[PDB]
Amino acid sequence: GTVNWSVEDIVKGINSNNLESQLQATQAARKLLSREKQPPIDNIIRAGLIPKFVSFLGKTDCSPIQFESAWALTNIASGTSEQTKAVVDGGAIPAFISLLASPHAHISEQAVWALGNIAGDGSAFRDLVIKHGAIDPLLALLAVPDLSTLACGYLRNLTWTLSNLCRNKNPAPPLDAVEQILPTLVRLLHHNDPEVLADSCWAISYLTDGPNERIEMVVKKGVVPQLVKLLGATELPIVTPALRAIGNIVTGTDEQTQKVIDAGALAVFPSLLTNPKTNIQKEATWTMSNITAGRQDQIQQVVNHGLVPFLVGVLSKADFKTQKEAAWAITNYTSGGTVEQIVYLVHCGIIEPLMNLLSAKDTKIIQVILDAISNIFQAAEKLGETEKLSIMIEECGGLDKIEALQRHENESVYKASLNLIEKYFS
Ligand SMILES: NCCCC[C@H](NCc1cccc(-c2cccnc2)c1)C(N)=O
Ligand SMILES: NCCCC[C@H](NCc1cccc(-c2cccnc2)c1)C(N)=O
C-alpha cells in the first residue's frame, strides 16, 4: 500500500482534503525516509512537507497520523545539521514536547527520540529544547518506583535523549538544567541494562568535561564509586565512557582526584594500561598523567598500587599517542615527586625507554622527555649521583640521542640538549 511511493504522490496525498489520504501519504513518506540506501530527505524537504508533518503532530483526534508524522520528522532530524534545522524551523520543538505526555507510548517515545536528535545537533538547539521546557516532561516519564517496570527500548531512548541534553560545549549546558537532570542520571547510572549504563556514563563524561565547578557538581552527587565500578565492566561500550568520565574528573582539583583514588580506581589500571583496545590504553595513560601531576601522597599511591612498572611498559611499547601520554605521566611524576619516588622510578627501568623515544620525529614528546631527564638529574644532584645516572644514560645509548639533538630544528630542544650535555656529560 505505502511502499516506494514517489515524492510527487506523497505530496498529492498530503495536500488532499482527506485525513485518511493524508495519513496514508504520511506513512508512505515515513517509509521512504526510513530506507537504508540514501533516503530522499532533501527532496522531502524541498517539497515543503515539513510544516505539514508538524501540523499533523497536533492532531490529537488521529493518533496514527501523529505517530507517522513524528517518525517522518525524526528521520529528517537525525540527518545533517541543515536538515535538523529545517525541522526546528517548521516549529517542531514545542509540538514534540506536547507529545511527551501522549497517552500512546509509541508516540511519546517517538517525541523523546526526536528531541534527542534535535538537542544532539549542537549547543544552540540543545539550549532551545531546554528553553521550550523539555526537561520536566522528560523527567516525568522516568518517575516510577522501579525503572525495571519500563519497557527496555523506551528507557534506552529516554536515557539517550537525556545524554544529548548534557552533551555539547561552548557553551556547556545551563547550570540549572544540569542540576535538574543529575539526580535522574545518578539513578540511571545504577540501572541494570548495558545500553542505559553506557549512555548514562556518556552523559556523566560530558558533564565532567569542563572547569572544576562542573566536575564538582557531579562529584558531589556521589557517583565516583559507581563510575569506578563501571570502569571494571566487561563491556567495552561501558568502560569507554566510564574511563572518559574518570579521566575528566582527575583533571580537577587534588581533592576531586582523591575521590577517584579513594574509590579504588587505581586497582583497575593494570588491566586498562594493557588493554587490547588502543583508545582504552591511551585514555588510561592520559588519566595516569593527570594523577601523577597531583600531590606527592597521590604519586605514592600510584607507587603503592604497583603502577609504575605498567607506565614503564607503556613507554616501552604502545601506540605512539599512548607513548606520548606516558612521557607526560613520567614528566609530571618527576616534576612533582620526592627524591625517593624518583629513585624508585629509575629502579623500575624508566631510563632506557625514555631514551629510546628521543628518536621520535615529534618535537613535543622530545621536549617533554628532556624535561623528565632534567628532573631526574635534579633528584640525582641531591643524592650526589649524577655520574651514576650519566653512565646509565650513556650505556643504553642515551648520550648519542641527546647529542644528536644538538643539531635539531627546535630552539627549546637545542638549548635543553646542550645544557644537559655540558652540565652532566664531561
Ligand atoms: N594550558 C592549556 C592546557 C595544557 C595541558 C593539556 N593538554 C591536553 C592534551 C593534549 C594532548 C592530548 C590530550 C589527550 C589525549 C588523549 C586522551 N585525552 C587527552 C590532552 C590540557 N589539559 O589541555
Ligand atoms: N598544578 C597542577 C596542575 C598542572 C600540572 C602541570 N602541568 C602539565 C600537565 C599536567 C597534567 C597533564 C598534562 C598533559 C599534557 C599533555 C598531554 N597529556 C597530559 C600536563 C605539571 N607540570 O605537573
Question: Going from the N-terminus, what domains does the chain have, and what CATH number goes with each?
Answer: 1-426 (1.25.10.10)
DSSP 3-state of 179: helix
**φ, ψ of residue 346 in degrees (nearest 5):** -65, -40
**Pairwise CA distance, residues 336 & 354, whole Å:** 18
Burial grade of 33 (CB within 10 A; 0-12, 13-18, 19 or more)? buried
Q: Which of 328, 331, 366, 367 to mutate to test the pocket of ligand 2 (most atoms within 8 A of CB)?
A: 328
Spatial CB neighbours of 388, under 8 Å, sequence gap ≥ 6: 380
Say if residues 173 and 165 touch (Cβ distance below 8 Å). Answer: yes
**Pairwise CA distance, residues 230 & 359, whole Å:** 38
Q: How far is the CA of 290 from the centre of ligand 1 (A)?
A: 10
DSSP state at residue 266: G
End-to-end CA distance of the chain: 89
What is the residue with the minimal CA distance to atom 13 of ligand 1? 286
Ligand closest to 295 (CA) is 2
**Pairwise CA distance, residues 223 & 188, whole Å:** 11
The C-alpha cell that represents 233 in the structure block: 565492566
DSSP 3-state of 406: coil
**Pairwise CA distance, residues 241 & 203, whole Å:** 9
Burial grade of 418 (CB within 10 A; 0-12, 13-18, 19 or more)? middle
Method of determination is: X-ray
**Pairwise CA distance, residues 389 & 355, whole Å:** 13
CA 309 distance to own-chain centroid: 28
Hey, what's the torsion of the CAs at 283, 289, 293, 299, to 10 degrees?
110
**Pairwise CA distance, residues 85 & 323, whole Å:** 42
The C-alpha cell that represents 222 in the structure block: 556521589
Say if residues 14 and 52 touch (Cβ distance below 8 Å). Answer: yes
Spatial CB neighbours of 80, under 8 Å, sequence gap ≥ 6: none
The C-alpha cell that represents 398 in the structure block: 642515551
- The set of protein residues with a Cβ atom below 6 angstroms from ligand 1 is 251, 282-283, 286
Q: How far is the CA of 118 from the centre of ligand 1 (A)?
A: 30
Cis peptide leading into residue 171 (ω within 30°)? yes
